[PDB]
């Protein structure tokens, strides 16, 4: 399964210019495009090699889409401040996430189009791609306006048609990037806390895609409530890293095993100090 997702952020700054609009687009865990309204000459910019080869018409049209969206988000922020009766002095954020998930059969599995205001759910297109779920009274104003405008029909046309076609095109043109899996390189490190205790840290490095499971077990029983687990983080080269750690009695290190699951592994790994 694969996905294409767009992430829009608009932030007002009263007294310091018009709102800034940022857009990024991803296929699965790989970014391919960026736009920033505050750049000197704002243009859609490639972030992956499999879109750098698109012609000038593609890039002009994408740029024009983002410029229009930035202008639309300025009016949305003004409308929202009014709906909520917020003071004109405060900074506010509007976020949008939309895109399409393809199933294993390469067909549309789910389309989505949802919005948050000041980091909180505001309105979302339902899975049927015909109706809306509004999170509060202010969002019911937007819901009525979009129902009147038949907004869902326009978004449904994109999510069911255009979005899927773009995703399939990118998956093919970027297949060497997007349709690989890099398995994690794994190892355990050992750090004495005292003469009596040590932490064992199980590392997974260099893997793609980002989804992964790391678990510590002890004589066969899993240690969920005593495992320190950091959020999966980017290496910066397109791949990801993660570690999981436990604190263990000195002399009992050998009783613990770390277990790694990733789609790129030929079989699950078990590591023992």
């Amino acid at each position: 399964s694969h996905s294409m997702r767009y992430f829009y952020t608009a932030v007002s700054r009263p007294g310091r210019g018009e709102p800034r609009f940022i857009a990024v687009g991803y296929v699965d865990d790989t970014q391919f495009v960026q736009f920033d309204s505050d750049a000197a000459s704002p243009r859609g910019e490639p972030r992956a090699p499999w879109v750098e080869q698109e012609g000038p018409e593609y890039w002009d049209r994408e740029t024009q889409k983002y410029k229009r969206q930035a202008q639309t988000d300025r009016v949305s922020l003004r409308n929202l401040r009014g709906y909520y009766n917020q003071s004109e002095a405060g900074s506010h954020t509007l976020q949008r996430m939309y895109g399409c998930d393809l199933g294993p059969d390469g067909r549309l599995l789910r389309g989505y189009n949802q919005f948050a205001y000041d980091g909180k759910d505001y309105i979302a297109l339902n899975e049927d791609l015909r109706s809306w779920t509004a999170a509060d009274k202010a969002a019911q104003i937007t819901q009525r306006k979009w129902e009147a405008a038949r907004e869902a029909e326009q978004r449904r046309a994109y999510l069911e048609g255009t979005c899927v076609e773009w995703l399939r095109r990118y998956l093919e043109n970027g297949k060497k990037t997007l349709q690989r899996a890099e398995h994690p390189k794994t190892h355990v490190t050992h750090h004495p806390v005292s003469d009596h205790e040590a932490t064992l840290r199980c590392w997974a490095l260099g893997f793609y895609p980002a989804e992964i499971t790391l678990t510590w077990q002890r004589d066969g029983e899993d240690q969920t409530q005593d495992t320190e687990l950091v959020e999966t983080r980017p290496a910066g080269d397109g791949t990801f890293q993660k570690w999981a750690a436990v604190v263990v009695p000195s002399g009992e290190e050998q009783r613990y095993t770390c277990h790694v699951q990733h789609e790129g592994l030929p079989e699950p790994l078990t590591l023992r100090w």
Binding site: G25, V33, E62, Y66, Q69, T72, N113, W146, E151, Q154
Partner: peptide, 10 residues
């Protein structure tokens, strides 16, 4: 390719 038709003003 981004979703560009229409004007989705809240």
């Amino acid at each position: 390719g981004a979703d560009g038709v229409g004007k989705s003003a809240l």
